[PDB]
Nucleic acid binder design. Structure first.
Ligand code: MG
Ligand code: MG
Ligand code: MG
Ligand code: MG
Ligand code: MG
Ligand code: MG
Ligand code: MG
Ligand code: MG
Ligand code: MG
Ligand code: MG
Ligand code: MG
Ligand code: MG
Ligand code: MG
Ligand code: MG
Ligand code: MG
Lengths: 394, 61, 131, 107, 24, 60
RNA sequence: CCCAUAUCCGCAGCAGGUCUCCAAGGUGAACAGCCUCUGGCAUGUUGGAACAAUGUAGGUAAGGGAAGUCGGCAAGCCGGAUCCGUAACUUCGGGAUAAGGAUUGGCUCUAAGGGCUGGCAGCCGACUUAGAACUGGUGCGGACCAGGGGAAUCCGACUGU
RNA sequence: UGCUUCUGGGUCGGGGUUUCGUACGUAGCAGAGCAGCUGCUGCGAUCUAUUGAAAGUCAGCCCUCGACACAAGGGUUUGU
């Protein structure tokens, strides 16, 4: 017969290959479409999820009850050090697929990028790129490279740039830097390749790529949760207590008549560690990193126009299971995918974003920097010492 | 922003934190954490418990 | 103009809240919540400022044994405000309010939350203290 | 160079964190043996009965957090083995573990 | 040890057992 | 090597249980070749095996 | 000699079955439960490394409180003692620990409850009962032990098999 | 993911953060009171000072460049 009381289905078939992701770094599946009216720029960036805190800001939306009020919202800190450009790649357009035509690396390539090409850096003799770097100080090699760039002027349609993260400034345990192709969308192919050759062997910060109050896309791998049951993974209804052979299970698989179990039947398996791409994430603030001038360093990154305090965005006791953020960072509305220390791909928006909630200008009031490692109740060290007084150890 | 003090402890509650509790007679109280919440619901004296601000104001520390 | 945001709901079908006005009733048994589409094995629940269908369980004989419409004012379940406070109350309370919004009682004992007071103007007029 | 006697303080708590109640003190003995095998490259580790009593002083559940251990690499006596040297592991009674460095004591 | 006797009979599927019954 | 016979005989001579029979771990071979109650009485007089005292149970 | 989680019977070193004696200290009404002394033993046909899903045995859950289900199934609530108080009905015996309340810790005191010798005097041995003060973050039968209750209907008097 | 540019991981210790809530000892003409000697000496739960004290804190928290030893290692294999 039929189902008596109809119900919506548990889970989505658009995400059904729930396997462990083969890639660890979040890959861009689709870059934004180019147009020659816009100038040349990067369309993606590769940051690292640091932590979470509050935010305090004014709401400017007409008609709401929440208009001109001081709300709090969850934000993600993503530490985004400036990446090093160490190569380019062109793409020819074929009726079979968008094929990579010719990849051209740089002359001086740092050891951070050298770590990626090796599975075992200790036993290796560190002899990569040695016969390739001899093409940059001879007569014939420069001619062959100029012929390669001149062929890329003619036949390449899509030009992606090769940039790797700067891992030495990061507080992570690993030293192997992540590499990434970023599609440069801008003017003509010749101006695009000239700008990429100008930006070769250069630093790329985040102020050049993104800006304030921009809706961006976050690509990354889900926090892994291991082999889980169907109640934990697909969130099905639990069977009652009186069941003999288990209750946190799926009772009926299917009918007698498709002598198989269908793909849509919710089974038990891998929960977490899945590649995901979430859209419409709002940047509240791109904070400056630590910099030293006139002797003492300037670290007031959590300072707003209304706070005027010398505290940084690093909370009391640092970020939990991440370390301390010394580099320049971005701060996003809501939560992003992934655990701590997770590599996290930023991307510009695919959709032409013109909405009232999306075109809102954000003026920050207070950035919460209390200790997230437990119930924190102080914002900074001098405020804590002024409230506590002299201690026994002091 | 209005930094309201805790009713049990007297600590400076920030707008991201706290759990506010209103009784039937009125007198809306603010609490920093569930420690102070459980102490108020079990009706403990803040002047008798050592780590509060009222203990320090009473015993001149 | 300004619509109501979602808050935490912890009074499903079955809850006996108390009736916080001077009609004569003491309890209000929630029989269903007005304004819920529904889904398989979900109880309809009402938070602060929700129009609900109740029944006077004990009180006046003119009030008992018939269905009244009500508005839930106070709940014990902690619900998040937009400015970032978790305000919660001592008990679960509501008042008998007809289909258009007019109250049946005159005065309201206890505080009425502003999430109910901004949505229902006639309940906020009878309320002395707010939230 | 080979015959070296020296002091260490083992934090048993970060090595015992996680295991169940009936398997805390034998696991603590196993991490002290792994500590000896890590600092001293000798597979033949012989821990003393006084340190057995010191670990098992409270019970099988409650194991002390820090402990003071004299670790000594020694040349092998008769009944010769493919292990050329051995490691003797001795308990040292210390009141409090405040500012205790790895003191390399002399013979 | 001597030859074990054959696995004994156990009324497993009579009218007395509700774990399996046929159309009646 | 094997001292359960000497421990049982020492319990039978000392008129207590073998929980209180303390055997000498150093002089194992001098106890192991006793094999008789007359030699175990000589071990008692030599003091190689000792009656263990009662485990305390205070009344205080 | 074993006399029973290995010497008996169950196909076996089988969580089953098999008739008796001896019977410490505390806590406590107790030969109840928990810890210990004499005596005994190596965790019950094995160990090592991780702590995935489904399990089995224990628990804990904000708000609601049976809305789940054939059905309060299971779990949970009450639980000891002292002082009150205890209904309908009845075969006047019961119901009844009905139902419904208060107290319970530690410390320091006071009062009362006795023998032997020569209304009095001297010398000694016992546990209880009642009351008061002080004090601890209202916690106190703090583990263990340990009744959920009330109103009705049908059947069988009952105890028993 | 890491495993010799006098450089790097690890161990310990030190700080940072945080959890509970004020440790032992000593002192107190503080303490319901009780006993003994001509005000003192003993018992006494609890209170105050030392003392936001004592204890724990990565096993999957944050910085140390303070002490310590270790780390240019072993094996199997793959050819246009
Ligand atoms: Mg249908
Ligand atoms: Mg069953
Ligand atoms: Mg936290
Ligand atoms: Mg249903
Ligand atoms: Mg057996
Ligand atoms: Mg037992
Ligand atoms: Mg076992
Ligand atoms: Mg065993
Ligand atoms: Mg609950
Ligand atoms: Mg509750
Ligand atoms: Mg029902
Ligand atoms: Mg039951
Ligand atoms: Mg009755
Ligand atoms: Mg009838
Ligand atoms: Mg009968």
């Amino acid at each position: 017969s039929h189902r008596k009381f109809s119900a919506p289905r548990h889970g989505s078939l658009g995400f059904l290959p729930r396997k462990r992701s083969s890639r660890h770094r979040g890959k861009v599946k689709s870059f934004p479409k180019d147009d020659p009216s816009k100038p040349v720029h990067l369309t993606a960036f590769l940051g690292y999820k640091a932590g979470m805190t509050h935010i305090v800001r004014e709401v400017d939306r007409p008609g709401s009850k929440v208009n001109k009020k001081e709300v709090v919202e969850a934000v993600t800190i993503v530490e985004t050090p400036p990446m090093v450009v160490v190569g380019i790649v062109g793409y020819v357009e074929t009726p079979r697929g968008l094929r990579t035509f010719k990849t051209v690396f740089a002359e001086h390539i740092s050891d951070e990028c050298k770590r990626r090409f090796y599975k075992n850096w200790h036993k290796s003799k560190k002899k990569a790129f040695t016969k390739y770097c001899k093409k940059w100080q001879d007569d014939a090699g420069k001619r062959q490279l100029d012929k390669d760039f001149s062929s890329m002027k003619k036949y390449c349609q899509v030009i992606r740039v090769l940039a790797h993260t700067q891992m030495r400034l990061l507080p992570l345990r690993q030293k192997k830097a992540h590499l990434m192709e970023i599609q440069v969308n801008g003017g003509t192919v010749a101006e695009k390749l000239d700008w990429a050759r100008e930006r070769l062997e250069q630093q790329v910060p985040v102020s050049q790529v993104f800006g304030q109050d921009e809706m961006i896309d976050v690509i990354g791998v889900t926090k892994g949760k291991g082999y889980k049951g169907v109640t934990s993974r697909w969130h099905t209804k639990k069977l009652p207590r009186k069941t003999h052979r288990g209750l946190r299970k799926v009772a009926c698989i299917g009918a007698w008549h498709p002598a198989r179990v269908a793909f849509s039947v919710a089974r038990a398996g891998q929960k977490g560690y899945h590649h995901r791409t979430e859209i419409n994430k709002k940047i509240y603030k791109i904070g400056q990193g630590y910099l030293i001038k006139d002797g003492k360093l300037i670290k007031n990154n959590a300072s707003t126009d209304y706070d005027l305090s010398d505290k940084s965005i690093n909370p009391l006791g640092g970020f939990v299971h991440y370390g301390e953020v010394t580099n320049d960072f971005v701060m996003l509305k809501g939560c992003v995918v992934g655990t701590k220390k997770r590599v996290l791909t930023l991307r510009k928006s695919l959709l032409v974003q013109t909405k009232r909630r999306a075109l809102e200008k954000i003026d920050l009031k207070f950035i919460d920097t209390t200790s997230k490692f437990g119930h924190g109740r102080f914002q900074t060290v001098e405020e804590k010492k002024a409230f506590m007084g002299p201690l026994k150890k002091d | 922003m209005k930094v309201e003090l805790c009713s049990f402890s007297g600590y400076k509650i920030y707008p991201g934190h706290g759990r506010r509790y209103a009784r039937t007679d009125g007198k809306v109280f603010q609490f920093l954490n569930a420690k102070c919440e459980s102490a108020f619901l079990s009706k403990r004296n803040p002047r008798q418990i050592n780590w509060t601000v009222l203990y320090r104001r009473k015993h001149k520390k | 103009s300004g619509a109501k945001f979602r808050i935490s709901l912890g009074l499903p079908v079955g809850a006996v809240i108390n009736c916080a006005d001077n009609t004569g009733a003491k309890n209000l048994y929630i029989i269903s919540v007005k304004g819920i589409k529904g889904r398989l094995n979900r109880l309809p629940a009402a938070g602060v400022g929700d129009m609900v269908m109740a029944t006077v369980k004990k009180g006046k004989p003119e009030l008992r044994k018939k269905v009244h419409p009500a508005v839930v004012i106070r709940q014990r379940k902690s619900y998040r405000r937009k400015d970032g406070v978790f305000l919660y109350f001592e008990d679960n309370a509501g008042v008998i309010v007809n289909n258009k919004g007019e109250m049946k009682g005159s005065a309201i004992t206890g505080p009425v939350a502003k999430e109910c007071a901004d949505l229902w103007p006639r309940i906020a007029s009878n309320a002395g203290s707010i939230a | 160079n080979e015959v070296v006697t020296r002091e260490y303080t083992i934090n048993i708590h970060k090595r015992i964190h996680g295991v169940g109640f009936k398997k805390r003190a034998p696991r603590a003995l196993k991490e002290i043996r792994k500590f000896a095998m890590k600092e001293m490259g000798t597979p033949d580790v012989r821990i003393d009965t006084r340190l057995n009593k010191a670990v098992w002083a409270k019970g099988i559940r409650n194991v002390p957090y820090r402990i003071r251990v004299r670790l000594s690499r020694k040349r092998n006596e008769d009944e010769d083995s493919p292990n050329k040297l051995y490691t003797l592991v001795t308990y040292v009674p210390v009141t409090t573990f405040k500012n205790l460095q790895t003191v390399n004591v002399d013979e | 040890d001597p030859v074990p006797y054959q696995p004994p009979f156990l009324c497993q599927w009579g009218r007395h057992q509700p774990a399996w019954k046929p159309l009646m | 090597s094997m001292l359960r016979l000497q421990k049982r005989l020492a319990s039978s001579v000392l008129r207590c249980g073998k929980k209180k029979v303390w055997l000498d771990p150093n002089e194992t071979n001098e106890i192991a070749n006793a094999n008789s109650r007359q030699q175990i009485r000589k071990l008692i007089k030599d003091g190689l095996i000792i009656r263990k005292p009662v485990t305390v149970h205070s009344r205080a």
